[PDB]
Amino acid sequence: RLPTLADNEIEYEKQIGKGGFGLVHKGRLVKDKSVVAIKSLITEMIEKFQEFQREVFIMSNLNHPNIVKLYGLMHNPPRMVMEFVPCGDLYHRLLDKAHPIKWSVKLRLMLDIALGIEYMQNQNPPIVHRDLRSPNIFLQSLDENAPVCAKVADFGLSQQSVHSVSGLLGNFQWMAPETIGAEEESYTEKADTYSFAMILYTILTGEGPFDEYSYGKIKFINMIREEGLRPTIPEDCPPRLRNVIELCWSGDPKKRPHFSYIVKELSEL
Ligand SMILES: Cc1cncc2cccc(S(=O)(=O)N3CCCNC[C@@H]3C)c12
Ligand SMILES: Cc1cncc2cccc(S(=O)(=O)N3CCCNC[C@@H]3C)c12
């Protein structure tokens, strides 16, 4: 099911953050002493309750090593109890320029994320995250021999059944073109595939996607949609990686590949 643990089973330790519908806490699980993260819930915008519920539904149906696991629920207030991932997030790690990630570790990271997404796309119906970017990838370990190096986190914006329209304004540098300016079949799983190409770009270069450019917001969106504007892949990138990224970021969603092709090409690098 989704199990309920309320208060006796859990012990709090600190506070590790704020951000979305409440307060996040570090804590631990008293029965076997696993360490966990605890997400709490704090009119018309008081329907972020709907957000909390949606995150629950999606998580309860996922069970994979490269996806953050939901342990249980707690009541009064409403809380989510999830595994705690020790080494921070990908976006912050890439910001340390003095200590670049080594090439073999970079490959693990790329593959580990691709496995997580492949699993999501194989569900019926397919699960779409909708907010994939570097701050949403959490790091379990940076040892090249660890069983797991990276995990997909924060299903704050996602859905089932391949449909949804344009919604809420976004950091457009990570999103597929059919999702930004409005469209109709927009938000299939193919949109996540475009976001994955940006994650590959960032891991490869250590840089933000589209940071080479400066445009006003309307102009930038039009360049990406109509002119095919993309980040520049460096000359020394291996050709096999260059191909995977270019296919993944195609303007036509139908040309973005299946994750079975993607995992195979990455394993050959
Ligand atoms: C959304 C949801 C979706 N799927 C399974 C669930 C199992 C238990 C509780 C919920 S839940 O509604 O999200 N939820 C928050 C409070 C509402 N009722 C009980 C529980 C505390 C589920
Ligand atoms: C789930 C989780 C799991 N493990 C470690 C964590 C460390 C910091 C923040 C979180 S976290 O709360 O999930 N989280 C995501 C929501 C945005 N604000 C808080 C931070 C980004 C962790």
From Swiss-Prot:
Disulfide bonds: none
Protein kinase domain residues: 10-269
Stretches assigned to coiled coil: none
Transmembrane region(s): none
Catalytic residue list: D131 (proton acceptor)
Positions that bind ATP: I16, G17, K18, G19, G20, F21, G22, L23, V24, K39
Family the UniProt entry places it in: Belongs to the protein kinase superfamily. TKL Ser/Thr protein kinase family. ROCO subfamily.
Entry protein name: Probable serine/threonine-protein kinase roco4
Provenance organism: Dictyostelium discoideum
